[PDB]
């Protein structure tokens, strides 16, 4: 049994259920995901929770993250996942298309003090953009 | 309106419903899809109905092709679709993985005599293979 | 003859030659690429120039960006490009892998005052990472 | 591993275009079902015409780079990347002259110490995108 992989699976489950009441259990106070720096200055459990909320709002309550595979090496965990969603919310200046999409993701997680301390994630931006009909942005904001 | 695009949409719906009673309406008697040459020597509506049945049996009755976009140029149609399924039957000598998957597909269809005459399709093999957990074949035959 | 497309082509050639002396001609003073917020607080011609220099340093002097196609819609340009390189510098806490790679990219450019004002780009992260041999990070930094 | 060594020679053959010695590692009953549309050949002769077709269509400078290779019993799985330039006719599409690069997965079955079954999955969609998504001029 890996506590690290268990913790990462709790993180995946949060995106699925949208339930983040217990996020402080597994998200470090100093948690950072550099991928959302454009959108927020938050850190820690608050940052992770708001990103979950963003996924649920932009990609619908039916948005799911399926596990392909998870592995670990020392204090790091790598997760191979697949996002399923429907584009119901505005995203980087693009109006909702209402279109279904699915895309692989890779997530890289560093543990510090038994908690997720750094989180990088790579969506399949181009593949998702294609499935969304390659919308033109209506603004840069 | 385009009759060709309409015919390609009927083709897509046949994969989705598994209903193939009427395939002779839009599939040419000389219909060929070179992608299944390995598995069968069939042609025409017969080939198409078998391939539909293969999809339903292998990727489950819930297997679905969603339309992203379809364009046409003269007697040719190009469809951008996404396949969704669960791997529940043997395929190319790999045992069922039970794995959900989804992958974009490009289809190229040539119309002749008002019917789909040639059909090339490109699954996202590698993308799907990853989602299946990259299974090793148990055999190069049937099994 | 689109001046916007010509400007985006000069931008592409900059990554190719590594020459940034003239970037003020086509990069807006308030130019932003949100993709590099993790790495730098720079803006304008200076931000664009350091990012080109980053590419040449990390993906080698031989790194090339190839044009597949470029379209425009009003004050916006969308470029379909392909990056070729070899991973020779540190990148997000990963040691250099020395690996060749190539990945499609989508770039979205907003023009203001006849210069590039906003720039978003989507590398094929997962495809590239596979070609890199999927390295584990040595640090989060 | 002699199997991995044999698969590396196979990869080298695409790179050099040199097919003189393919009978060394290609089984007399060698099949690649991906080319059934284009030829009825089998064995070393099939493998050799497929390498020639690659050199002809994707240029003499076309090459396969290795990402990783692994094996399980009598099977080898090779993760590769094709680099090429589209200079020859291909499934009814005229040469675009365009550069492209795409990952491939190859699955090889060994029988009697030689490559007997060969399946390969190009990144068709990604390559097609890099080629400008040309429309075919003919089905044949
Ligand atoms: C035009 O859409 C995107 O930029 C996009 C695409 C194509 C694919 C994706 O998977 C995401 C986004 C954008 C995006 C997020 C995506 O996953 C995201 O998770 C995301 C987030 O988790 C928090 C704030 C903003 C976000 C985004 O703007
Ligand atoms: C091991 O998996 C495959 O070969 C495969 C993958 C990775 C992705 C795919 O989309 C397909 C297949 C195999 C396959 C078919 C796929 O779509 C298919 O439609 C298919 C078919 O329609 C009729 C006979 C055989 C078939 C296959 O062997
Ligand atoms: C581990 O690799 C990456 O993070 C990465 C990958 C997989 C693919 C890519 O294309 C890029 C990066 C990272 C990266 C940049 C990539 O293109 C980049 O352009 C980049 C940059 O232009 C300026 C600062 C940092 C950068 C990066 O960290
Ligand atoms: C329109 O392009 C293709 O069909 C194609 C694409 C998009 C990507 C590819 O990698 C290949 C082909 C076509 C193709 C081969 C590709 O790799 C190939 O190796 C190939 C071959 O090895 C022998 C005969 C025909 C072949 C092809 O028609």
3-state secondary structure of C39: coil
Helical ranges in chain B per DSSP H: 3-17, 44-58, 125-131
Check: CB of residue C139 under 8 Å from CB of residue C126.
no
Q: What is the greatest pairwise CA distance in chain B?
A: 48
Check: CB of residue C3 under 8 Å from CB of residue C25.
no
Sheet holding B27-32, edge to edge: B27-32, B115-123, B100-112, B76-86, B64-73
Ligand 1 proximity of A122 Cβ (cutoff 6 Å): no
Q: What are phi and psi of C89, to 5 degrees?
A: -125, 160
Counting every residue, how long is chain B?
Answer: 143
d(CA A25, CA A113): 12
Chains that touch B (3 or more CB pairs under 8 A): A, D
Over the Cα atoms of chain A, what is R_g?
A: 15
Closest CA to ligand 4's atom 22: D50
Residues of A with CB below 8 A from B133's CB? Answer: 68-69
Check: CB of residue B137 under 8 Å from CB of residue B94.
yes
Burial A15-54 (b: 16+ CB within 10 A, else e): beeeebeebeebbbeebbbbbbeeeeebebbbbbbebbee
Specify the ligand 1 atom closest to the Cα of A126: 7
d(CA A3, CA C42): 40
d(CA C51, CA C66): 17
User: B35 in contact with A at a CB cutoff of 8 Å?
Assistant: no
Q: How many folded domains does chain B comprise?
A: 1
Counting every residue, how long is chain D?
Answer: 140
Check: CB of residue B26 under 8 Å from CB of residue B14.
no
Over the Cα atoms of chain D, what is R_g?
A: 15
Return all residues near A86 (Cβ < 8 A) that are at least 6 apart. A59, A60, A62, A63, A98, A99, A100, A101
For C134, nearest residue in chain D (alpha carbons): D67
Check: CB of residue B126 under 8 Å from CB of residue D105.
yes
| CA neighbours closer than 13 Å in the CB half-sphere of residue A1 | 3
Counting every residue, how long is chain A?
Answer: 141
d(CA C106, CA D134): 19
Query: Which residues does residue A86 pair with via DSSP β-bridges, in sequence order?
Result: A100
**Experimental method for this entry?**
X-ray
d(CA A76, CA A4): 8
d(CA C115, CA C11): 11
End-to-end CA distance of chain B: 46
d(CA A41, CA D93): 51
> Is C104 within 8 Å of D129 when comparing Cβ atoms?
yes
Closest residue by Cα to residue C127 from A118, D126, D71: D126
d(CA C108, CA A1): 45
Closest residue by Cα to residue C68 from B123, A57, D98: D98
**β-pair type (D26-31, D114-122):** parallel
Q: What single-letter DSSP state applies at residue C85?
A: E
d(CA C76, CA C70): 11
**β-pair type (A27-32, A115-123):** parallel
Query: Which residues does residue C122 pair with via DSSP β-bridges, in sequence order?
Result: C106
Closest residue by Cα to residue C129 from A30, A121, B89: A121
| Structural domain boundaries, residue B118 | 1-143
Q: What dihedral do alpha carbons B38, B43, B48, B54 form, nearest 10°?
A: -30
Q: Nearest bound ligand to CA A59? A: 1
Return all residues near B109 (Cβ < 8 A) that are at least 6 apart. B4, B8, B11, B76, B77, B78, B79, B116, B118, B119, B120
Resolution in A: 2.1
Q: Interhelix angle for C44-58 vs C3-17, to 10°?
A: 40
Check: CB of residue A105 under 8 Å from CB of residue A40.
no
Looking up residue A114, the CATH number of its domain turns out to be 3.10.450.50
Check: CB of residue A134 under 8 Å from CB of residue A45.
no
Helical ranges in C34-117 per DSSP H: 44-58
Check: CB of residue C52 under 8 Å from CB of residue C15.
yes
Q: Interhelix angle for D43-57 vs D2-16, to 10°?
A: 40
Residues of C with CB below 8 A from D68's CB? Answer: 133
SS (H, E, C) chain D: CHHHHHHHHHHHHHHHCCCCCHHHCEEEEEECHHHCCCCCCCHHHHHHHHHHHHHHHCCCCCEEEEEEEEEECCEEEEEEEEEEECCCCECCECCCCCEEEEEEEEEEEEECCEEEEEEEEECHHHHHHHCCCCCCCCCC
Check: CB of residue D108 under 8 Å from CB of residue D125.
no
d(CA B85, CA C140): 37
Check: CB of residue A14 under 8 Å from CB of residue A83.
no
- Interface probe, candidates D82, D125, D130, D133, chain C, greatest C C-beta count within 10 A: D130
Closest residue by Cα to residue C138 from B56, A75, D7: A75
Integer angstrom CA distances of residue A103 from A70, C129, D73: 17, 16, 33
């Amino acid at each position: 049994r890996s506590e690290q992989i268990a913790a990462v699976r709790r993180m995946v489950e949060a995106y699925n259920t949208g339930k983040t009441d217990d996020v402080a259990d597994y998200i470090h106070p100093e948690y950072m995901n550099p991928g959302t720096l454009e959108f927020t200055s938050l850190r820690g459990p608050e940052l992770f929770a708001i990103n979950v909320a963003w996924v649920k709002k932009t990609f619908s309550e039916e948005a799911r993250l399926e596990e392909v595979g998870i592995e670990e090496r020392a204090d790091w965990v790598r997760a191979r996942l697949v996002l399923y969603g429907r584009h119901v919310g505005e995203m980087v200046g693009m109006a909702p298309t209402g279109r279904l999409f699915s895309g692989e993701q890779i997530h890289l997680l560093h543990f510090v003090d038994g908690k997720i301390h750094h989180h990088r994630d790579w969506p399949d931006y181009q593949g998702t953009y294609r499935q969304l009909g390659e919308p033109w942005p209506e603004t840069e904001h």
